[PDB]
Design an enzyme around this catalytic site. Structure first.
Site, PDB file in Angstrom:
ATOM      1  N   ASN A  16       4.250 -24.686 -15.258  1.00  0.00           N
ATOM      2  CA  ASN A  16       4.126 -26.092 -14.826  1.00  0.00           C
ATOM      3  C   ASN A  16       3.816 -26.238 -13.325  1.00  0.00           C
ATOM      4  O   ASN A  16       3.388 -27.318 -12.902  1.00  0.00           O
ATOM      5  CB  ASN A  16       5.471 -26.819 -15.054  1.00  0.00           C
TER       6      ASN A  16
ATOM      7  N   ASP B  51      11.459 -30.051 -18.051  1.00  0.00           N
ATOM      8  CA  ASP B  51      10.835 -28.865 -18.574  1.00  0.00           C
ATOM      9  C   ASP B  51      10.234 -27.968 -17.516  1.00  0.00           C
ATOM     10  O   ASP B  51       9.414 -27.175 -17.827  1.00  0.00           O
ATOM     11  CB  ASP B  51       9.770 -29.273 -19.583  1.00  0.00           C
TER      12      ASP B  51
ATOM     13  N   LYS C 261       8.932 -25.184 -14.976  1.00  0.00           N
ATOM     14  CA  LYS C 261       8.787 -23.737 -14.998  1.00  0.00           C
ATOM     15  C   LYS C 261       7.565 -23.318 -14.230  1.00  0.00           C
ATOM     16  O   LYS C 261       6.749 -24.136 -13.922  1.00  0.00           O
ATOM     17  CB  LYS C 261       8.716 -23.210 -16.429  1.00  0.00           C
TER      18      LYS C 261
ATOM     19  N   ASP D   5       2.676 -31.581 -16.158  1.00  0.00           N
ATOM     20  CA  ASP D   5       3.393 -31.591 -17.430  1.00  0.00           C
ATOM     21  C   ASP D   5       4.531 -32.575 -17.530  1.00  0.00           C
ATOM     22  O   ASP D   5       5.683 -32.223 -17.595  1.00  0.00           O
ATOM     23  CB  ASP D   5       3.892 -30.196 -17.755  1.00  0.00           C
TER      24      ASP D   5
ATOM     25  N   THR E  59      11.795 -25.291 -22.324  1.00  0.00           N
ATOM     26  CA  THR E  59      11.552 -23.840 -22.489  1.00  0.00           C
ATOM     27  C   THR E  59      12.899 -23.114 -22.403  1.00  0.00           C
ATOM     28  O   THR E  59      13.610 -23.285 -21.423  1.00  0.00           O
ATOM     29  CB  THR E  59      10.468 -23.339 -21.488  1.00  0.00           C
TER      30      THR E  59
HETATM   31  C1  LIG Z   1       2.281 -26.379 -21.317  1.00  0.00           C
HETATM   32  C2  LIG Z   1       0.862 -25.936 -20.923  1.00  0.00           C
HETATM   33  C3  LIG Z   1       0.321 -26.695 -19.697  1.00  0.00           C
HETATM   34  C4  LIG Z   1      -1.077 -27.275 -19.995  1.00  0.00           C
HETATM   35  C5  LIG Z   1      -1.368 -28.356 -18.976  1.00  0.00           C
HETATM   36  C6  LIG Z   1      -2.187 -28.116 -17.859  1.00  0.00           C
HETATM   37  C7  LIG Z   1      -2.339 -29.167 -16.920  1.00  0.00           C
HETATM   38  C8  LIG Z   1      -3.237 -29.077 -15.738  1.00  0.00           C
HETATM   39  C9  LIG Z   1      -3.567 -30.123 -14.927  1.00  0.00           C
HETATM   40  N1  LIG Z   1      -4.424 -29.714 -13.961  1.00  0.00           N
HETATM   41  C10 LIG Z   1      -4.716 -28.384 -14.112  1.00  0.00           C
HETATM   42  N2  LIG Z   1      -5.485 -27.544 -13.418  1.00  0.00           N
HETATM   43  C11 LIG Z   1      -5.603 -26.266 -13.745  1.00  0.00           C
HETATM   44  C12 LIG Z   1      -4.929 -25.741 -14.842  1.00  0.00           C
HETATM   45  C13 LIG Z   1      -4.096 -26.567 -15.591  1.00  0.00           C
HETATM   46  C14 LIG Z   1      -3.987 -27.915 -15.228  1.00  0.00           C
HETATM   47  N3  LIG Z   1      -1.724 -30.348 -17.153  1.00  0.00           N
HETATM   48  C15 LIG Z   1      -0.946 -30.532 -18.217  1.00  0.00           C
HETATM   49  N4  LIG Z   1      -0.357 -31.771 -18.418  1.00  0.00           N
HETATM   50  N5  LIG Z   1      -0.777 -29.553 -19.113  1.00  0.00           N
END
Ligand SMILES: CCCCc1cc(-c2c[nH]c3ncccc23)nc(N)n1
Length: 279
Positions: A140, A135, A137, A153, A166
Site C-alpha cells: 500500500n 489495511d 502495508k 488503497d 492482511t
Molecule cells: C491491493 C493491491 C493494490 C492495487 C492498487 C494500486 C493502486 C495504485 C495507485 N497508483 C499506483 N501507481 C503505481 C502502482 C500502483 C498504484 N491503487 C489502488 N487503490 N490499488
C-alpha cells in the site's frame, strides 16, 4: 464552480496493468490531450452490485476525495461507461515499497528513519482527519518518481462518526473484539518499522490461523542487528493493549511519537521538501 467536462475512456490510451484489488484492477493510462500518466482503478458495476460492495466503493471514493497531502495518492477524476467505474489516481512510477524491501534486503538506519518519518507524518495527517486506513502495508506504501511515499488503497478504510486486513499486519483488538481505530494503524506501523530493519514482518507462520495465534500472544523477537532506538519504538507500538500504543489519543497523540529518540535528527515540518536517502 464550473469544473471541467467529464473524462471518458477514449480520452486515454490504456496500457499495462499495475495491480489487482478485490473487486478492481488498476491500469496505467496516458491522457492523450496532456501526455499525463494516471493509474486508473477500474471497477465492474455488476460485480460490485452482485458482491454487495456499493458501500465499499462509495466510502473509498469519498475518502480519496477528502485527501490533500503529498504522502497520499490523489483522486484526479472519476467517470463511468455502461459497464464500468473509473477512478483516476496518481501514478507512483517507482512502485511499492515491498519491492524495495525485497531488492535491497533490509534498510539502513537513515532510510528506515526517513521512510518511517514519512509514514508517521502521513498517519498524523490521515488521523487528524478522522480517517483510518485499516489495511496498511508496504504493498500500500507506494514510491513516486522522487522516491517520496504515496499511500493508496482506501477501499478498506473507515471514517470516524467490521473488516479484517492482511493477516501479518492485523492488530490484536481486531482479532478479539472485532473492533478498530487509529491504534490499528499504529500497530501496522510498528510491523512496518520492524520489516524495514529486519527484512521480514515480525509475526510469520505456516498459515493465517498460526499468524493470528502469534499476534495475540505477542510471539515475536528482534534480530541481534536491530537498531536499539528503532527496537524501542517498535516495542512502544507492538503493545497488546491498544490504549498504551505510542501515538494514540490516550498516550497523548502524535507529539510524544514524533518526539521518540529514534527521530531526533528528523525535521517533521518539511519532509516532502527533503531529498530521500539513496537505497
Ligand atoms: C491491493 C493491491 C493494490 C492495487 C492498487 C494500486 C493502486 C495504485 C495507485 N497508483 C499506483 N501507481 C503505481 C502502482 C500502483 C498504484 N491503487 C489502488 N487503490 N490499488
Amino acid at each position: 464552480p464550473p469544473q471541467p467536462r467529464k473524462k471518458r475512456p477514449e480520452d486515454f490510451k490504456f496500457g499495462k496493468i499495475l495491480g489487482e484489488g478485490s473487486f478492481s484492477t488498476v491500469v496505467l493510462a496516458r491522457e492523450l490531450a496532456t501526455s499525463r500518466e494516471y493509474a486508473i482503478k477500474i471497477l465492474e458495476k455488476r460485480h460490485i452490485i452482485k458482491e454487495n460492495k456499493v458501500p465499499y466503493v462509495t466510502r473509498e471514493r469519498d475518502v480519496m476525495s477528502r485527501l490533500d497531502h503529498p504522502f497520499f495518492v490523489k483522486l484526479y477524476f472519476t467517470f463511468q461507461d455502461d459497464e464500468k467505474l473509473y477512478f483516476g489516481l496518481s501514478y507512483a512510477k517507482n512502485g511499492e515499497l515491498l519491492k524495495y524491501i525485497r531488492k535491497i534486503g533490509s534498510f539502513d538506519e537513515t532510510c528506515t528513519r526517513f521512510y518511517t518519518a514519512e509514514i508517521v507524518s502521513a498517519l498524523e495527517y490521515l488521523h487528524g482527519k478522522g480517517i483510518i486506513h485499516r489495511d496498511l502495508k508496504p504493498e500500500n506504501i507506494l514510491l513516486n518518481e522522487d522516491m517520496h511515499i504515496q499511500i493508496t488503497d482506501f477501499g478498506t478504510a473507515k471514517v470516524l462518526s467490521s473488516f479484517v486486513g492482511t493477516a501479518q499486519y492485523v492488530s490484536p483488538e481486531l482479532l478479539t473484539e472485532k473492533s478498530a481505530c487509529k491504534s490499528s494503524d499504529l500497530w501496522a506501523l510498528g510491523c512496518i518499522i520492524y520489516q524495514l530493519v529486519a527484512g521480514l514482518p515480525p509475526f510469520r507462520a505456516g498459515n493465517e490461523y498460526l499468524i493470528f495465534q502469534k499476534i495475540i500472544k505477542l510471539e515475536y523477537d528482534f534480530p541481534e542487528k536491530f537498531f536499539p532506538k528503532a527496537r524501542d519504538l517498535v516495542e512502544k507500538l507492538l503493545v497488546l493493549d491498544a490504549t498504551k500504543r505510542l501515538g494514540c489519543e490516550e498516550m497523548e497523540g502524535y507529539g510524544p511519537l514524533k518526539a521518540h529518540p529514534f527521530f531526533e535528527s528528523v525535521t517533521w515540518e518539511n519532509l516532502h521538501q527533503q531529498t530521500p536517502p539513496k537505497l
